[PDB]
Write an enzyme that holds these catalytic residues in place. Structure first.
Site, PDB file in Angstrom:
ATOM      1  N   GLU A  35       0.716  -1.248  -0.066  1.00 57.73           N
ATOM      2  CA  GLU A  35      -0.226   0.310   0.130  1.00 57.73           C
ATOM      3  C   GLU A  35       0.899   1.711   0.295  1.00 57.73           C
ATOM      4  OE1 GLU A  35      -3.208   0.521  -0.712  1.00 57.73           O
ATOM      5  OE2 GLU A  35      -3.759  -1.302  -0.511  1.00 57.73           O
ATOM      6  N   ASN A  46      -7.769   9.413  -5.747  1.00 56.63           N
ATOM      7  CA  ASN A  46      -8.585   8.457  -6.015  1.00 56.63           C
ATOM      8  C   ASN A  46      -9.039   8.698  -7.018  1.00 56.63           C
ATOM      9  OD1 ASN A  46      -8.448   7.254  -3.369  1.00 56.63           O
ATOM     10  ND2 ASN A  46      -7.322   6.165  -5.060  1.00 56.63           N
ATOM     11  N   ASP A  48     -12.268   9.384  -7.919  1.00 59.67           N
ATOM     12  CA  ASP A  48     -13.156  10.049  -7.462  1.00 59.67           C
ATOM     13  C   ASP A  48     -13.262  11.066  -6.634  1.00 59.67           C
ATOM     14  OD1 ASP A  48     -12.643   8.628  -4.820  1.00 59.67           O
ATOM     15  OD2 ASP A  48     -14.297   7.832  -4.558  1.00 59.67           O
ATOM     16  N   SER A  50     -11.552  11.058  -4.077  1.00 64.37           N
ATOM     17  CA  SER A  50     -11.002  10.552  -2.210  1.00 64.37           C
ATOM     18  C   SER A  50      -9.604  10.283  -1.937  1.00 64.37           C
ATOM     19  CB  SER A  50     -11.817   9.399  -2.367  1.00 64.37           C
ATOM     20  OG  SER A  50     -11.322   8.281  -2.240  1.00 64.37           O
ATOM     21  N   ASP A  52      -5.997   8.222  -0.412  1.00 63.55           N
ATOM     22  CA  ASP A  52      -6.136   7.153   0.572  1.00 63.55           C
ATOM     23  C   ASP A  52      -4.804   7.847   1.519  1.00 63.55           C
ATOM     24  OD1 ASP A  52      -7.309   5.646  -1.169  1.00 63.55           O
ATOM     25  OD2 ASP A  52      -6.127   4.104  -1.871  1.00 63.55           O
ATOM     26  N   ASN A  59      -9.042   5.214   3.414  1.00 66.66           N
ATOM     27  CA  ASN A  59      -9.350   6.384   2.487  1.00 66.66           C
ATOM     28  C   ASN A  59     -10.588   7.646   2.523  1.00 66.66           C
ATOM     29  OD1 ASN A  59     -11.813   6.319   0.109  1.00 66.66           O
ATOM     30  ND2 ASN A  59     -11.016   6.887  -1.059  1.00 66.66           N
TER      31      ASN A  59
END
Ligand SMILES: [Cl-]
Ligand SMILES: [Cl-]
Ligand SMILES: [Cl-]
Ligand SMILES: [Tb+3]
Length: 129
Positions: A35, A46, A48, A50, A52, A59
């Site tokens: 990750e 991301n 959309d 959002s 991380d 998220n």
């Protein structure tokens, strides 16, 4: 902070992730590797809108507040910035909530695609724990 593999395993173990929801320590260390490459300051936007954050790329759509993810929730009741700290407490406490939802560690796309089913114990092999 960029943790070393065994250093992260020991921090996670102290914070009670080892065997949390039946997930052995190697699973958590493997997930962190893919990750964030063990980097607490890792962030990734991301599609959309959002973002991380942190060692486990948690998220903003559901888990933390960053002030710029419209219609999102903050189920861990923290600012997303708290997930970037050298101290992994906030990331661990929030990851415990995530993994307690019905999907387990499949919530972490890198874990599903790169850790799940592998010899995850190799990630803690040789560590003094
Ligand atoms: Cl927001
Ligand atoms: Cl906040
Ligand atoms: Cl599970
Ligand atoms: Tb859910």
């Amino acid at each position: 902070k960029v943790f070393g593999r065994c250093e992260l395993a020991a921090a996670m173990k102290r914070h009670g992730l080892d065997n949390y929801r039946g997930y052995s320590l190697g699973n958590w260390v493997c997930a962190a590797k893919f990750e964030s490459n063990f980097n607490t300051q890792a962030t990734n936007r991301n599609t959309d809108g959002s973002t991380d954050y942190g060692i486990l790329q948690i998220n903003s759509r559901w888990w933390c507040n960053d002030g710029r993810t419209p219609g999102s929730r903050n189920l861990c009741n923290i600012p997303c910035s708290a997930l970037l700290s050298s101290d992994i407490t906030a990331s661990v406490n929030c990851a415990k909530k995530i993994v307690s939802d019905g999907n387990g560690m499949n919530a972490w796309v890198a874990w599903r695609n790169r850790c799940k089913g592998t010899d995850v114990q190799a990630w803690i092999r040789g560590c003094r724990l």
